[model samples]
Target: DMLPEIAAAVGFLSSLLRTRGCVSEQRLKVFSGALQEALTEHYKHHWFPEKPSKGSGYRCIRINHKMDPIISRVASQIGLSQPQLHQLLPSELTLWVDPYEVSYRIGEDGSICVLYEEAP
Candidate 1:
């Protein structure tokens, strides 16, 4: 019963995460791009270098303290009430962004290459 809705949400999030562009260039651009850039920039200036507290690899970070309004707005836009939206989402899911690739390797062709070494 919930399979279709779950599929739709996964598709939406995957496409949103894969796309990247400045919001100014395209007003309809997804929020992931903007959020990723903002978080990356913030971390670049603010993150402290520490030993591997977690693992040393690509990871997704989520923030929900400010996500209530965003979720509410999206739910309203799609004609779903908060309760409906809540039911469709996992208890652990929320607004999220992936971190920047802080390290890179030199390519065979003498180019810089950055890759997400962690598993999806």
Candidate 2:
């Protein structure tokens, strides 16, 4: 139930995060894809990185502004309410896409790999 709803929610969230001006189009796409993947596909926790800042924090692609309308819409779409989804997300949670930078992929079975070391 929550699994599929989340994918649709991310779709709405992604489009809003993009067409409305929060996150970049590219990051939004990859982030949306990966997020739905995290739920429907498999628990690819390996792709999500921890800053290890106290060994608990995460790298967040923040929404720039805490837009209530945006979060609220996606929340209802996901079957949760404002603060519920608000606290549930991580600002929405990346990889490089060029040479001298890095390359990566998540397999059909959640096998993670990187061409070069991930960015700083």
Per-prediction CA RMSD (Å): 14.1, 14.5
Q: All models: lDDT?
A: 0.35, 0.40
Q: Write the per-residue lDDT of candidate 1 for residues 1-120, one digit (tens) a residue.
A: 222222233344434433431223232233434433433443343332343223333222322323244445543544445564444443334322222222222222344333322321
How many residue pairs clash in each candidate at the backbone level?
Answer: 0, 1
Q: Per-prediction TM-score, please?
A: 0.31, 0.29
Poorest 10 consecutive residues of model 1 by lDDT?
95-104
The residue pairs in collision within model 1 are none
Judged by lDDT against the true structure, how good is candidate 1? 0.35
Best by TM-score: 1
Best by lDDT: 2
- For model 2, residues 1-120, the per-residue Cα lDDT tens digits are 223334544565566455544445565666676666554333234232332222112211233236244345434554445554444443432222221223222323343334343233
Q: Please give the distance, in angstroms, between residue 46's alpha carbon in candidate 2 and its true position after superposition.
A: 21
Off by over 4 Å in 1: 1-67, 100-120
